[PDB]
From a paper:
The N-Myc downstream-regulated gene (NDRG) family is a member of the α/β-hydrolase superfamily and is repressed by Myc expression. Although NDRG3 has a high structural similarity to the α/β-hydrolase family, the substitution of the residues of the enzymatic catalytic triad and narrow folded cavity due to the presence of helix α7 and helix α10 indicate that NDRG3 is a nonenzymatic α/β-hydrolase fold protein. The NDRG3 ΔNC structure includes two domains: A canonical α/β-hydrolase fold domain and a cap-like domain. Compared with NDRG2, the helix α6 region of NDRG3 is a flexible loop.
Numbering used by the authors:
A (entry chain A): 29 to 317
B (entry chain B): 29 to 169, 183 to 317
Write the structure that this text describes.
């Protein structure tokens, strides 16, 4: 049913898990998780969902785990030159090659969404679709003006990442979802290693995507060539960014999905609704008639 | 590099024009023109355009001419039972069968867009994509050439009566057998509601039925269609649908602005994975 690989790249080992058996012409639904998650935390709930299972039947699922984020990962030595976001994306063609895959339908969350998007800009041949959840193509704001002070380099990691995931009101309520995902961030990931991955995602440069004007397309400023499903909860802190990302992609190949009564982790909070959206998206490309 | 066929169906002959040789698994780009046009009037301008030629290259093109609307068509006897819009759509599977075509990427205008939309609802597996130009999915509720001019061109556009409009008066007037054109107009004005309805991601929505293919709705900012085309968009699945309002444009976007619409169509094809 499942098969783990530790794949060697010029930027270090990356751990991937292939559940289901890849097919001749069919692409694999490839997965990159967000900061403070691994593949298991981010999507295992979503891909185990009854309706999604009928989709994962036809496609093989290759879960990528960002370097050092894989469960039971050893700490990198303090000097360690953890890969840049751009570099993390340069690890994926090796992954595809090693598993003899020809193309992928990506599903990314935050850091994942950026990585897969960079990857798809770098390698349009290997990307057919992207479902980008809570994606931010702009570089991290040096300050959030909706706060009481600035204290960037002297606050807890787990609390930073929680904030990145969950809306202000959702986080203050501190319900089973938040308590559950404090514990996931604190215990499931190597805290030493996680700091490096966080730092990589916080250092991300601007994607550079710009929507083209159909008339007089001379400059042809680059965007994603593939079909894209941008997904964000109404109450995700991401909404500002995800709408901006949509403002910079080709509307003929892009759809925005603002999920109702939703915050961080739409794929776990409302997997029933997101599945059906993914199903329509796949049907667009000609799969799952 | 073209071939004409008169294809006899249960509901009568339909004249089609295949330019290019069909591939085994690639769909053909199939065409259905609007009231008061034929494929030449409606699409010849667009499909010959430089940038489109490089697309049409990799697909076969199959141009359908609505009954009696094809060039040199003889007038049907006065009693003649002209096909309903629903019937006109039922004539397409036979066209596909007889030319041994497996599936199509449809480009419709007005009546054409309804007909190809009806077709897709009836036979989803056969439709892979639809470029619906100036489509109207609702029912309507003297001089025929003037009526049709009005259907096509914006009020301001039409009052200005420039090269485009005086060219297309003559097209409507002299290209198509006038007896037949009335019957076709009658069929399009009788069109029933498509009965598409946008699905709610939570409600299963069994009763509601929508196009299951990738759709590019196209209208010019000044087209009388705009209200209807936006209506259409509001009733299709947003995950499989894009609305394209074309700047400084009225009737016949595909003629007025082929450069823009080509580019749109190329990205729409790239969405489904073709012309990589």
């Amino acid at each position: 049913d499942s098969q783990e690989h530790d794949i060697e790249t010029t930027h270090g080992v990356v751990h991937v898990t292939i559940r289901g058996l890849p097919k001749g012409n069919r692409p694999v639904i490839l997965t990159y998780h967000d900061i403070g998650l691994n593949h298991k935390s981010c999507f295992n709930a979503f891909f185990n969902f009854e309706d999604m299972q009928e989709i994962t039947q036809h496609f093989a699922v290759c879960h990528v785990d960002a370097p050092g984020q894989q469960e039971g990962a050893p700490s990198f030595p303090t000097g360690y030159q953890y890969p840049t976001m751009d570099e993390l994306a340069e690890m994926l063609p090796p992954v595809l090659t090693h598993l003899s895959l020809k193309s992928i339908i990506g599903i990314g969350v935050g850091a994942g969404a950026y990585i897969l998007s960079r990857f798809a800009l770098n390698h349009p041949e290997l990307v057919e679709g992207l479902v980008l959840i809570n994606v931010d193509p702009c570089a991290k704001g040096w300050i959030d003006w909706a706060a009481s002070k600035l204290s960037g380099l002297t606050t807890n990691v787990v609390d930073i990442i929680l904030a990145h995931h969950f809306g202000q009101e959702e986080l203050q309520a501190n319900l089973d979802l938040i308590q559950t995902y404090r514990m996931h961030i604190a215990q499931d990931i190597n805290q030493d290693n996680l700091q490096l991955f966080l730092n990589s995602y916080n250092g991300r440069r601007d994607l550079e995507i710009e929507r083209p004007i159909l008339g007089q397309n001379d400059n042809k400023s680059k965007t994603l060539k593939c079909s894209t499903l941008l997904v964000v909860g109404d109450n995700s802190p991401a909404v500002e960014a995800v709408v901006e990302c949509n403002s910079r992609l080709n509307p003929i190949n892009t759809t925005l999905l603002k999920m109702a009564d939703c915050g961080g982790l739409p794929q776990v909070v409302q997997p029933g609704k997101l599945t059906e959206a993914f199903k329509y998206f796949l049907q667009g490309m000609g799969y799952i008639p």
